[PDB]
Structures are given as structure tokens and as C-alpha cells.
Design a protein around this ligand. Structure first.
Ligand SMILES: C[C@](O)(COc1ccc(C#N)cc1)C(=O)Nc1ccc(C#N)c(C(F)(F)F)c1
Length: 247
């Protein structure tokens, strides 16, 4: 299981937000912690992504762009899985020091998005997603959103994406003799992966509007995140950069 060995080997560890939980909840504090946590996780998504089999095959410029576009969705998918395994979807497990109950979901002003992520979290359970399916689906997620005008080396991207789909096939075929069984499973998983995109979009829209009025709500936007929200996120929102849906 060479491929799976690698994914398990590079899977990021626990990342904390640095949030002050002895402090009464406030929109400003929660969001500053969400921004900090997001920036902390990106550091790991970068090290993780660059260690992915075949990732270096991509053109330099395409590697960064792909990470930046997939950033939100990758965090959403992993957060849902954490919420499922840690608290059985009872709450959103952004980080051990940043757990959201409905009250926090409401005070964050991202309640609708959070409810969609709790549902995602429940999906991991209902579909009985295995730890290995999760790891392959996550890696696959990284290669599921590109520019309409294409990447610098679109062909190397296509091959890579195809190879990751094949890996998912293999993990599904493993311990499944009936193709019909493999087919339904592939159907379920690709359906789950697609569902992540609309979620990231709402978060993208939400974060973008917040940045634009950040000086009003007293939100301190990290330098790196600010740049990406103003340079990359608008491409996704304006339709220049779109996710690849299966269905
Ligand atoms: C509000 C914001 O701080 C915005 O952060 C970003 C992250 C990526 C982009 C992009 N591209 C833009 C803003 C945020 O959503 N942070 C944030 C931080 C951590 C996690 C986890 N796990 C998540 C989520 F939604 F679960 F994916 C979101």
C-alpha cells in the first residue's frame, strides 16, 4: 500500500488556534482566531501538498495557485472529519481550542455555513467513510478547482488528477468484488466531494465581504490571508476560477 502509506505519513498533525476560551465569546475574537487558525493550517497544507506523490510534477506557478484555491475546501473537509471522529458531529471541531456549539456558530455570523459543515460531518458517519477513503478524497480535493484559462501546465495537472481518481478507484475496489458495489461507492464519494465546493464558496463570499469591511467590524486580517482573499478569492467569485464537479 505504497500510496496510502505516503498519505498517512504526510497527514498534518493537530493544529491549535491560540484562542482565549476564558474570554466571553465575541464576533471579533472568534473571527481573529478563525483567521489565525486558517493561516496556521495553510502552513501545513503547503508542506503536506508539496509532499504529495507527483505534486512536484506541476509547474511552480500551478503548485501555489492550486494550493491557494483549494485552501478553504481542504480545511472544510478535514474539519468535518475531525468533527465526526472527535465529537460525533455534536460540534464543529475547528481545533481542540476552537470548538463551535450553535451559540458560537451564531455569534460568528457563519451559522448557515457552519450548519452545512455539521451536515458534512454527519455524512462521514452515515456513509461510514473509512480513514483511508478520507485521506484519498482529501488529496483529490486539492486537484479539483482550476482557472478556465487553464494552468501553466494543464496537461501535467490533468494526468495527476486522473492518477488520484485511479487511486480512489483502487481503495474502493479493495475488498469489493462486485463492480456494482464499487460503482455505488464511487457514486457516493464523488457526490460527497462535490458537496464540499458549495460550502467553500459561501465561506469565500463571507470572508471576502468581511475583508472589504474589516475596518468596520474590527477584524485583524493576517497579511498572507488578506493578499489571497483580494487576489485569488475574487477570481473564484467572479467565475474565472472554478471547481471541477463530478456530477
Ligand atoms: C473566516 C476565515 O478565517 C477565512 O479564512 C480564509 C481561508 C481561506 C481563504 C482562501 N482562499 C480565505 C479566508 C475562515 O474561514 N477560517 C477558517 C479557519 C479554519 C477552518 C478549519 N478547519 C475553517 C473551515 F471553514 F472550517 F474550513 C475556516
Amino acid at each position: 500500500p505504497i500510496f496510502l502509506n505516503v498519505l498517512e505519513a504526510i497527514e498534518p498533525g493537530v493544529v491549535c488556534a491560540g484562542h482565549d476560551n476564558n474570554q466571553p465569546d465575541s464576533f471579533a475574537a472568534l473571527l481573529s482566531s478563525l483567521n489565525e487558525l486558517g493561516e496556521r493550517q495553510l502552513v501545513h497544507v503547503v508542506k503536506w501538498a508539496k509532499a504529495l506523490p507527483g505534486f512536484r510534477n506541476l509547474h511552480v506557478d500551478d503548485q501555489m495557485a492550486v494550493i491557494q484555491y483549494s485552501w478553504m475546501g481542504l480545511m472544510v473537509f478535514a474539519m468535518g472529519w475531525r468533527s465526526f471522529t472527535n465529537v460525533n458531529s455534536r460540534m464543529l471541531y475547528f481545533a481542540p481550542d476552537l470548538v463551535f456549539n450553535e451559540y458560537r456558530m451564531h455569534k460568528s455570523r457563519m451559522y448557515s455555513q457552519c450548519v452545512r459543515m455539521r451536515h458534512l460531518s454527519q455524512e462521514f458517519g452515515w456513509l461510514q467513510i473509512t480513514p483511508q477513503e478520507f485521506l484519498c478524497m482529501k488529496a483529490l480535493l486539492l486537484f479539483s478547482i482550476i482557472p478556465v484559462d487553464g494552468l501553466k501546465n494543464q496537461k501535467f495537472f490533468d494526468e495527476l488528477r486522473m492518477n488520484y481518481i485511479k487511486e480512489l478507484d483502487r481503495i474502493i475496489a479493495c475488498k469489493r468484488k462486485n463492480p456494482t458495489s464499487c460503482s455505488r461507492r464511487f457514486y457516493q464519494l464523488t457526490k460527497l466531494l462535490d458537496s464540499v465546493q458549495p460550502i467553500a464558496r459561501e465561506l469565500h463570499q463571507f470572508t471576502f465581504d468581511l475583508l472589504i469591511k474589516s475596518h468596520m467590524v474590527s477584524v485583524d486580517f493576517p497579511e498572507m490571508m488578506a493578499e489571497i482573499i483580494s487576489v485569488q478569492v475574487p477570481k473564484i467569485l467572479s467565475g474565472k476560477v472554478k471547481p471541477i464537479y463530478f456530477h
